[PDB]
Amino acid sequence: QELEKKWYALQVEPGKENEAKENLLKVLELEGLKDLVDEVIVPAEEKVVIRAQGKEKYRLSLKGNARDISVLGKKGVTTFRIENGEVKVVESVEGDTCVNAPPISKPGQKITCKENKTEAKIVLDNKIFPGYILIKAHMNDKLLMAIEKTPHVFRPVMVGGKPVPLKEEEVQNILNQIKRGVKPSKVEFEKGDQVRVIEGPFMNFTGTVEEVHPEKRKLTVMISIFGRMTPVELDFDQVEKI
């Protein structure tokens, strides 16, 4: 078989992750190291942002099934097509030559339709761990020196003055993290739930949840103070379902 490569987190200048990646690739070329590296990734998600006369209309993942998107501009309609990680103008108003513009595929890139006043640009969103890029490679001294000599790159994460490998799962999870649509913080507590106050002056009294407040972690509980129904504001952590 073939010797497997490992993942390593590099440390680079925040906000220039894409630049550091481009820089690195170029350096791998000149130093004849390209074969030691199978991947260079910026922990983020590429997205297409479509605008119409200043206003943002859409923000969609670059990756996905072929999709067409039409937007009303000044003079009329412009339709963009996103497929195979590229974006182009399918058709725009009379006069817009953007329809001939070659498809874009990299962050920072853009196609503008001056007539319809429409445009689509590739950007990066969900960029967690800014100031880091990930490379799958076969580490060695030359590669290291090359990484360190690359403009906008500091050096890989060092443990014992030596690059430290990441687990495939760690990386995969990071990538899965990058691109999922963060559902609600669970739904423990919903109107009607019967609870017992476990902390504070209302401790041991029971009642029912009248209104939840997920974005504040508080509840409006109608507490039965021995029949004397009293609505009280409590924190999720000072009551218990029952």
Cα 6 to chain centroid, rounded:
23
Q: Which of 88, 110, 125 is the last residue of a domain?
A: 125
Q: Of 3, 7, 24, which is closest to residue 165 (Cα–Cα)?
A: 7
For residue 232, give the CATH number of its domain. 2.30.30.30
Say yes or no: 19 and 131 in one domain: yes
Residue for token pair 């097509």: 81
Cα 186 to chain centroid, rounded:
20
Say yes or no: 11 and 120 in one domain: no
Say yes or no: 83 and 65 in one domain: yes
3-state secondary structure the chain: CCCCCEEEEEEECCCCHHHHHHHHHHHHHHCCCHHHEEEEECCCEEEEEEEECCEEEEEEECCCCCEEEEEECCCCEEEEEEECCEEEEEECCCCCCHHHCCCECCCCCEEEECCCCEEEEEEEECCCCCCEEEEEECCCHHHHHHHHHCCCEEEECECCCCECEECHHHHHHHHHHHCCCCCCCCCCCCCCCEEEECCCCCCCCEEEEEEEECCCCEEEEEEEECCEEEEEEEEHHHEEEC
The experimental method, as deposited, was: X-ray
Whole-number Å distance between alpha carbons of 126 and 131: 13
Q: What domain range is 19 assigned to?
A: 1-43+126-178
Supply 101's token pair: 């513009």
Say yes or no: 103 and 73 in one domain: yes
Half-sphere exposure of 160 (CA within 13 A, CB side): 2
Region of residue 145 (phi > 0: left; psi between -120 and 50: alpha; otherwise: beta): alpha
Say yes or no: 170 and 143 in one domain: yes
CA-based angle 41:46:47, to the nearest 5? 175
Q: Of 8, 14, 6, 7, which is closest to residue 129 (Cα–Cα)?
A: 14
Whole-number Å distance between alpha carbons of 16 and 140: 25
Whole-number Å distance between alpha carbons of 121 and 143: 34
For residue 82, give the CATH number of its domain. 2.60.320.10
Q: Of 4, 14, 25, 24, which is closest to residue 168 (Cα–Cα)?
A: 4
Question: Into how many domains does the chain fold?
Answer: 3
Cβ pair 132, 43 in contact under 8 A? yes
Say yes or no: 117 and 131 in one domain: no
Whole-number Å distance between alpha carbons of 44 and 179: 8
- Give the other-Cβ count within 10 Å of 104's Cβ: 19
Say yes or no: 119 and 3 in one domain: no
Q: Helices 141-149 and 17-30: crossing angle, nearest 10°?
A: 130
Whole-number Å distance between alpha carbons of 32 and 155: 19
Whole-number Å distance between alpha carbons of 135 and 242: 50
Say yes or no: 104 and 3 in one domain: no
Q: Which of 100, 125, 150 is the last residue of a domain?
A: 125
Measuring CA to CA, how many Å separate 134 from each of 4, 196, 222? Answer: 16, 48, 52
Half-sphere exposure of 57 (CA within 13 A, CB side): 18
Half-sphere exposure of 1 (CA within 13 A, CB side): 3
Supply 69's token pair: 């998107």
Say yes or no: 51 and 71 in one domain: yes
Say yes or no: 240 and 136 in one domain: no
Residue for token pair 């009642």: 207
Residues sharing a CB contact under 8 Å with residue 68, sequence separation 6 or more, in sequence order: 79, 80, 81, 82, 90
Say yes or no: 186 and 221 in one domain: yes
Supply 120's token pair: 């689509």
- Give the other-Cβ count within 10 Å of 200's Cβ: 12
Cβ pair 135, 41 in contact under 8 A? yes
For residue 35, give the CATH number of its domain. 3.30.70.940
